[PDB]
Design a protein around this motif. Sequence first.
Motif, PDB file in Angstrom:
ATOM      1  N   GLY A 140      53.047  39.800  43.151  1.00 55.62           N
ATOM      2  CA  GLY A 140      53.402  39.460  41.688  1.00 55.62           C
ATOM      3  C   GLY A 140      52.972  37.971  41.280  1.00 55.62           C
ATOM      4  N   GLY A 171      50.068  36.598  41.232  1.00 52.58           N
ATOM      5  CA  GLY A 171      48.774  36.783  40.709  1.00 52.58           C
ATOM      6  C   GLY A 171      47.745  36.319  41.677  1.00 52.58           C
ATOM      7  N   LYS A 172      48.191  36.250  42.895  1.00 47.77           N
ATOM      8  CA  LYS A 172      47.285  35.779  44.090  1.00 47.77           C
ATOM      9  C   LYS A 172      46.047  36.803  44.138  1.00 47.77           C
ATOM     10  N   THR A 173      46.389  38.022  43.873  1.00 42.68           N
ATOM     11  CA  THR A 173      45.483  39.006  44.074  1.00 42.68           C
ATOM     12  C   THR A 173      44.433  39.073  42.786  1.00 42.68           C
TER      13      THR A 173
HETATM   14 CL   LIG Z   1      49.917  39.018  43.681  1.00 47.40          CL
END
Ligand SMILES: [Cl-]
Lengths: 187, 184
Positions: free
Chosen positions: A12, A14-16
């Motif tokens: 969660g 935001g790294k994705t």
């Molecule tokens: Cl993430």
Amino acid sequence: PGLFLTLEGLDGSGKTTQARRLAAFLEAQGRPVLLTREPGGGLPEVRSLLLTQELSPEAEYLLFSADRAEHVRKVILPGLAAGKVVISDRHLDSSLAYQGYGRGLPLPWLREVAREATRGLKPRLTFLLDLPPEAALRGLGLEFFRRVREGYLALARAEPGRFVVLDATLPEEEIARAIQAHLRPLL
Amino acid sequence: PGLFLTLEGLDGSGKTTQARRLAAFLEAQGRPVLLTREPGGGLPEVRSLLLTQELSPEAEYLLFSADRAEHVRKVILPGLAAGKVVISDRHLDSSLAYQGYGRGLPLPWLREVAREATRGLKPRLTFLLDLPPEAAGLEFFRRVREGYLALARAEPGRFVVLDATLPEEEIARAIQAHLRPLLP
Ligand SMILES: [Cl-]
Ligand SMILES: [Cl-]
Ligand code: NA
Ligand code: NA
Ligand code: NA
Ligand code: NA
């Protein structure tokens, strides 16, 4: 020659999304890129097993390590060999933060295990999307996640020439431009 | 205190037959026994992952090591704590023979991986059913078979090397004889 980049942080953070935006940035520059992730980039069944399975810290780490070894050998190194920028959404640092600082395993052993699994490969840059566990977009249970968050920050301050730590609460587009700024001198 | 015994050998060496016979013999002496095995005594689901096509030697070992860690923690150490004779049909030596001597992984790494969380746990005795490799590619099986014999040469008090071509009941009696002193 290729270039190995990783993204790290809490689920969660935001790294994705940022890994996707980074790949797109590279695509727009005409630079061959391979986007991948752990767990499951090596051994998809490891990912699926660990959704449900409860395990000791050692066994969890070792399963993750098997996935990582196959990921390195079959995906990452071959991509680098073709001269791709290879971006992994999570790599060894995730295990160090979660199974080490989170679950309590000692870092030197975790690294000795990894040494053969990773075959001396190191990310050139690692982007850490930092935020508190309560800000992750996806009392007592938070103590683990604070150990993980702090563990990541400990890793980052030990290797300030590899880690780039970003405020994960910033607008998505702004975080992506910060990533591009840090990356531009290396291309 | 409990007693930790293992059996080792190539597949088809009779290691499994002897493990079962040993459990039955020790029980006949009123000695409480836990018979277990690897792979799968820790993480049964590992069996599936181990069959993965063209798995790297490192990944193969690490899978075995995950099962083995869970096995040590959840099965073996608690069994020994209850004073049982714990018998494992395969343990770390299998990985050393197969992934180290067979697939070429460095033994010190294999051992350092394994060492964690075991509290120094070693088998008190390890019964090696030595089977000619053609009775198990053949080059691989020769390395594994000779690997096991190298392990046994290196730790001559721990390993008991048995000719697996002998009649099963003679092998069982030899195992029993080695065990006599460790029982009252
Ligand atoms: Cl993430
Ligand atoms: Cl057998
Ligand atoms: Na690893
Ligand atoms: Na990383
Ligand atoms: Na570090
Ligand atoms: Na042998």
